[PDB]
Design a protein around this ligand. Structure first.
Ligand SMILES: [Sm+3]
Ligand SMILES: [Sm+3]
Ligand SMILES: [Sm+3]
Ligand SMILES: [Sm+3]
Ligand SMILES: [Sm+3]
Ligand SMILES: [Sm+3]
Ligand SMILES: [Sm+3]
Ligand SMILES: [Sm+3]
Lengths: 315, 305, 305, 315
């Protein structure tokens, strides 16, 4: 079953969140890459991504995807070259080169991931639909819109018009700010009487202090982000709210690890009809008392850093 | 080089801190276990631990240790029998039991790991040395001592007298509180004219709010600990302080992942002699950045239950 | 010098910010009222406010104002009648009512203080100018505007058109959010070719967690606000920013005590020309010290109810 | 009724906390001093203090004390001259000079306040009892003892032996650390089979981060302490716990204002049989919901400073 088939039938598709983030974190060896893909699959991901040999990358993904109920998706991000002034025919040529690797490896679908400029997001979708494969487009923007002042609603409209059947947001903000952005996008599609499936790949980092440029501008980016990491409970709340908003492609970006994906899969186990592939016996009474979801759902966890602030100023 | 030859040759032994926590976190598949081991070895760990299939765990650990400059260590922790009050010979029997397997698999050394009672740790040391292999003993206690009131200085002295060639602290507090405990253990050994290598396997979780029982009593244990996780800069400061205090077997316990081990190897790359296998590009910015929690609606500390 | 002569002569008018909050805090005795007034005048305030016995309040204020370089001002705030939906002529009547007393006691000027609705503020301005005395109008709104959605730029324009010689913001947010609102009010007046003196009477409580309704909706209002209190360094930064933005009637509202007013006078002593009546000895240490809350078990922000 | 009479009958005596702190805060004029004394009396204080003309100071205190149920107490603090090496006969001469002003003005009792060295605290009590007036002694020390390593228990013992009928702690730590110190003192008196009334004049500032030197060593001392100020609820909890510990002279030191004293008086209004000399009608429902002691007693108030830490390192 393909990605549009699943989603058209109202299924909840779970992404393989921060694959790249995790490979980075682990210090990367096909075995290392195959093992990570497997952890995401075991956690419940229905998508195994590959990027940009590029062919071995695609092979390993396909290999693990065949071990469960998952698809292989090829992703492309913004060229770093747009800031390099050079953009246009040059941009589509790069996308085109990557499109070939993917068609050649016969991926299940494509994702225009990481894009801060709608204009460039569009060029990507235009090039990608020429494969005849389903295309998903996400924008690395918050409620205020992209780098040109293009609002989320309008960005959503233009991406669908360009041919994306799945739109959403990713990689710049935490789950809460990301879903607010997706709500804006959803309202853009409604007002324009257009339809598309929605997806969200938020950061697993809390970013209440970020400005419109996202977490990259926080002073802790990228080596002091540990304190902000979402617990599994934070992610279950995100999964539930995403589900309630109409999001059906629920994933994650930087900060996401297999256990965050498993939390999504477990939170939505009822709705999905299945679970992805002993605290109550602990010796201490007060520890046993924590073996109840309600306890964690209501606990305001401490940071453990009394000498540090709870927020920082961007820049 | 054996564990003791390394240490006597002035080398820094990097532990594979967090092994069990990582597998638990990744959700566990010999390949899954083999990969995790490789990550630690690749991060610079000189020890691949193995516990209690048993023959398999020991075999995978040995295979990855073979792949690099690492030893395999057999770990033993506090037993239910002792807490369930069977004491004496009875407790010595389960360790002997465990030893057997580590004997047959021929592990390089043994660690009496995770003991909240000095007494039971001693009984563990006395049993493990019957293996003729070097024995390391670590206590899950803080500056205030073990569960019967035995202070760190004394605990260190009884562990060495019992035959441990390496002693220290592990798994109950963050790096700073753990090293203060180690300092107390070291002053004890000195006041007693005793000598032994020191080790530390602290939590990678900041724990300023814990009482003498350790992080377990904190209400966030074990599923709400994320905010407390040490950054690599916190870990590098820990490695540096540990080295300066005289610690030469530097590892970690719950919360330590491979990247934390790697921070230790890089920090101490000059003292070791090699590395393990825009203004934010400067290490001193990170060493001085008071990172934010990102959780303004949450407290900074909790009271232990 | 009258309020308007002072301002046109380039002077900085220091308000007696916090008067009601202080008396409320001290628990209220004409002597008690007279002393509080003296504290503000002694801290540098150039205005002694009076509201609504009435003749007494006005008399005590005048006596202390007489003692120094201060004016007496009659304050009027949003009425229940307007919120209780009587609007139009009815609301104008209670202000006229209030004016009467301030007319007989001969106060120096009038302030339409504390209005969450531009419309009712205008009706207040239109009534108060019938006194022939200068009228100041301040809004209890933030950057997002009043309760009907009227933005700061527009609110400022309608208040001046209505006859207010002085406009600004008061009592709903901390100094920074209040001055951002003032900046918006100033851009409105500019886009409309209008001119008027500006004033600010912010809360002395830090309020980063409030929504458009102001600090009242925070769960700590009104008895758990202590941690939020501005230090004198926070107040000096506010005075300096207010001056730089062009504000010349600089006061405060809830939370401001005499020492906060004094911080304003000292900060601006060079721009005024006089003062009001071991490495911690340096002002730049205080200007840079990120003070601790002393409440590690409490959050740093709360969600408005 | 005198101070020993009240306390011997088991009455709860309420101090006039941070009189000096408050006068400082207000920028100081007999009228200013009389008004402050009155606010404390109106708040419930049974003691009006005067210090070190000194005579006018004593007159005003007496004057206001006569307006209610209060006594006038003369207080003496450590000489700053002990750090000036000069100490002994020199110290008692200063105390003696002050003792005369007070006997001359006929105060009701005397307080050896602010003392960081037990040795010097003792000299003060020795000089002061020579007036035939009741003497109270407090130490500015925490659980670890004074500047010489003299523990609280022993300090308590020596002060009583020197002639103090009332002992306690003050001016260096918050209510919680101060009462722990008083508990230690109380245990010292018990073990030595001695008896004395207990008193506490803690800071109204939370100081969980202070070292044995007290709040003077925190970096915010003395101009950045605002965030630490106790709410009236924090003080009611202190009053109740002080009462439960056996403390019967309940006061305060730096940071205390009349409203903190009133909170003590109200918390203990039942036990005392009287109160010292409209939120529920507020327009907003959620505001009306706060007119219940339980709400405040259970509310973990926010600091309002997300960009600041919750604790600082001493020094
Ligand atoms: Sm390589
Ligand atoms: Sm939220
Ligand atoms: Sm299984
Ligand atoms: Sm530290
Ligand atoms: Sm009355
Ligand atoms: Sm600011
Ligand atoms: Sm003077
Ligand atoms: Sm407490």
């Amino acid at each position: 079953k393909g990605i549009l088939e699943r989603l058209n039938a109202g299924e909840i598709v779970i992404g393989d969140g921060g694959f790249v983030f995790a490979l980075e974190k682990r210090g990367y060896h096909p075995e290392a890459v195959r093992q990570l893909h497997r952890e995401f699959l075991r956690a419940g991901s229905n998508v195994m991504q590959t990027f940009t040999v590029n062919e071995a990358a695609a092979d390993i993904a396909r290999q693990v995807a065949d071990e469960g109920d998952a698809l292989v998706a090829g992703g492309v991000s913004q060229t770093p070259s747009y800031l390099s002034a050079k953009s246009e025919t040059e941009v589509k040529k790069v996308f085109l080169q990557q499109l070939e690797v993917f068609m050649k490896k016969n991926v299940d679908f494509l994702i225009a991931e990481y894009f801060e400029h709608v204009e460039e997001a569009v060029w990507a979708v235009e090039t990608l639909i020429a494969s005849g494969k389903p295309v998903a487009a996400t924008m690395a923007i918050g409620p205020e819109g992209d780098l040109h002042g293009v609002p989320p609603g309008e960005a959503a409209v233009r991406l669908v018009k360009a041919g994306a059947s799945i739109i959403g947001v990713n990689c710049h903000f935490d789950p809460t700010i990301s879903l607010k952005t997706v709500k804006l996008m959803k309202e853009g599609l409604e007002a324009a009487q257009l339809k598309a499936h929605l997806m969200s790949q938020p950061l697993a980092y809390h970013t209440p202090d970020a400005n419109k440029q996202g977490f990259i501008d926080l002073p802790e980016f990228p080596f002091g982000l540990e304190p902000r990491v979402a617990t599994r409970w934070d992610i279950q709340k995100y999964a539930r709210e995403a589900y309630n908003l109409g999001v059906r492609y629920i994933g994650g970006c930087c900060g996401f690890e297999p256990y965050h994906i498993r939390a999504i899969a477990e939170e939505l186990a009822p709705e999905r009809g299945f679970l992805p592939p002993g605290l109550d016996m602990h010796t201490k009474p007060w520890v046993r008392a924590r073996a109840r979801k309600e306890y964690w759902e209501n606990l305001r966890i401490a940071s453990g850093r009394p000498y540090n602030p709870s927020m920082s100023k961007p820049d």
